[PDB]
Design a protein around this ligand. Sequence first.
Ligand code: HEM
Ligand SMILES: Nc1cccc2nccn12
Length: 289
Amino acid sequence: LVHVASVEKGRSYEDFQKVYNAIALKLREDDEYDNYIGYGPVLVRLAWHISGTWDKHDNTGGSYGGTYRFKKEFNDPSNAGLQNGFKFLEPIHKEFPWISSGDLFSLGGVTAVQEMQGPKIPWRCGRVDTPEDTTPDNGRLPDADKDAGYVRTFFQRLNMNDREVVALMGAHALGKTHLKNSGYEGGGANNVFTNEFYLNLLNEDWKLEKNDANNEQWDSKSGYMMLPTDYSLIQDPKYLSIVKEYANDQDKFFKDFSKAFEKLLENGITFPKDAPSPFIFKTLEEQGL
Ligand code: HEM
Ligand SMILES: Nc1cccc2nccn12
């Protein structure tokens, strides 16, 4: 299976900046969502979930096909709550109906990270919608109740190494867990992209507690929470080294996150040699908008 990127006909950087802007403006406008978290965190999670179905072995899944639009994937139990991201993006897709579904979902995540003051994430267009029968089956996204060895093995399927996994998990500073979606609850209301996941892991007093869904999670009295898979990054010595690196170097985290996230969103895609270079979108702030 080769998935060759194909630029939406006649479109260039300025087209995609407009789409970016529309998402960014809606992020600013619809600020009440999820107890004033806003939609930034769920859009990042959406971009990851649409990409994280990829399997390096056969090139199935991945962002290219935009298959989250189909019911099998839309209704994956692992994707519970992402319907809110999809609804957010509906009027954007109405305004810009030429963009492919994969490009929109992935661009949503890029826009969210940047608008939340995260690193710039270079982004390439050209994902092409594929048919319903290309939708990957449920069960390719990771479980949260597991340990470091699970996390490490899981992410080999996505061709991610230890550094990539640890960098990517820093997105867990964002938003919160919701008992009705995942069987985990809490984490506060953060919508600023920082390296605080690593700082919190290292510096908080964590207790292993059961939540109201009868699942174990790690909680601190300050109101922070970590999944078992998050906490595994400080249980495993190789992950721990990396957690400490990012806790001590915000810029390095930003740079590594940006690379890993771009890679995640592009796994499975063949870019022709004469494809445009990745785009780096300006934030609303940078544009004076
Ligand atoms: C072992 C890997 C991972 C596991 C088990 C995991 C699990 C979860 C779970 C259970 C939630 C709560 C969902 C809810 O209840 O609404 C969640 C939220 C989130 N995850 Fe992950 N995740 C993982 C990796 C990632 C990666 C790689 C990213 C992005 C780079 C990501 C970004 C997020 C974001 C942004 C949220 C918050 C969404 C919201 O506030 O609505 N996670 N994650
Ligand atoms: N631990 C965790 C996982 C996913 C999202 C999130 N937000 C705050 C904490 N958190």
